[PDB]
């Protein structure tokens, strides 16, 4: 009443990462960028990454959310010109 | 500038360490800068397999302190030769060393522009 | 939960009476009859809190 060996055979299961909302769309106080949950969002867009430059999301409200390192936590604000006096 | 390269102390240790409690207390009384570090490994060349024990003793002592020691401790040592190692520095005895201090030494301490200490200054 | 007399043992802690309790998982592993910390029972707020049960 056990299990065997020499049959590696070991399928893998599912995930579901994304950039949801990609860069520069109607910004809604909701899941910003994703690739590491428990995540700790940030302020506006993010531009820090194992790449160099940065990314703007011409979309501004409360905040977004990170992914733990990847992408690059937000902080470089960027409400967007669409955040002035009505 | 002969007012440069021309020396001015710089560190100088003097320690010991056995695969062990207190022996360093005989260390405290001879100076005043207790060394508390942990040697290790994992074999039987002495019964020192224990790879995570507190046996390493090292009573750091540059400038000021070392002076009192270089002093009251420099008489009972009989040699003065060979024991002279490259990197302007040297180690004799139950465990003791002291490093030179040409003018181009420090810089090797910077987190930045860490000039790998040229070999014409040291 | 999965009651496993394996250093894995579930317990709580009163509020000096603040009245009832609050959730907690544990491990004899170390400190046996050891278990204290404060909270706030329906009883006002705060209150010392032993855990033993």
């Amino acid at each position: 009443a056990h299990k065997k060996g020499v049959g590696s055979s070991k399928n893998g299961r599912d995930s579901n990462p994304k950039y949801l909302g990609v860069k520069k769309f109607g910004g809604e106080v909701v899941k910003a960028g994703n690739i590491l949950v428990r995540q700790r969002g940030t302020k506006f867009k993010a531009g820090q990454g194992v790449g160099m430059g940065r990314d703007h999301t011409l979309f501004a409200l409360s905040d977004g959310k990170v992914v733990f390192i990847n992408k690059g936590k937000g902080a470089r604000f960027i409400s967007i010109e669409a955040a002035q006096t009505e | 500038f002969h007012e440069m390269r021309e020396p001015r102390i710089e560190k100088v240790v003097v320690h010991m360490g056995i695969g062990h409690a207190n022996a360093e207390d005989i260390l405290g009384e001879i100076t005043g800068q207790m060394p508390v570090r942990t040697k290790a490994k994992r074999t039987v060349g002495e019964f020192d397999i224990r790879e995570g024990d507190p046996i390493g003793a090292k009573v750091t002592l540059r400038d000021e302190m070392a002076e009192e020691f270089l002093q009251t401790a420099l008489p009972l040592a009989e040699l003065a030769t060979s024991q002279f190692d490259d990197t302007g520095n040297f180690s004799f005895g139950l465990d003791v060393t002291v490093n030179l201090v040409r003018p181009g030494y420090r810089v090797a301490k910077r987190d930045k522009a860490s000039r790998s200490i040229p070999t014409k200054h040291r | 939960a999965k009651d496993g007399p394996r250093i894995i043992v579930k317990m709580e802690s009163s509020a000096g009476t603040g009245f009832y309790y609050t959730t907690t998982k544990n491990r004899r592993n170390t400190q046996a009859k050891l278990e204290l910390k404060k909270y706030d029972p329906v009883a006002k707020k705060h209150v010392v809190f032993r855990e033993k049960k």
Binding site: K43, A75, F77 | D111 | -
Partner: protein
């Protein structure tokens, strides 16, 4: 490493700690010889030479007082601008007795910290 991970000593990031928010970076840059602080506030902000050891000469009261004043005043200069509650800036070293000094400044300076 990235520029700030091979050198050593700083903590700039423990500056960015307060960066998040709270107010002006009542950042206090020190150099014994004297003390100099600005007011980096969010948005590519700026500053208003709120207090410096030279601005009004470097006196002759050493550490103590210096601060005691440089701050106060500083605090004085600003609250004229239109600030109010500014966040502190340990700029560097540990709120040493200097530091703490200047600090006083602000506080006494009425610029809440």
């Amino acid at each position: 490493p990235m520029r700030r991970r091979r050198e050593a000593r700083t903590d700039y990031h423990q500056r960015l700690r307060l960066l998040k928010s709270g107010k002006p970076r009542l950042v206090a840059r020190k150099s014994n010889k004297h003390v100099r602080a600005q007011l980096v506030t969010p948005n590519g902000d700026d500053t208003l030479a709120s207090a410096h050891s030279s601005d009004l000469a470097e006196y002759g009261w050493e550490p103590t007082g210096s601060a005691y004043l440089t701050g106060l005043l500083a605090g004085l200069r600003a609250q004229e601008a239109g600030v109010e509650e500014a966040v502190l800036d340990i700029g560097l070293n540990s709120p040493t007795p200097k530091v703490f000094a200047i600090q006083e400044g602000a506080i006494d300076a009425g610029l809440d910290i």
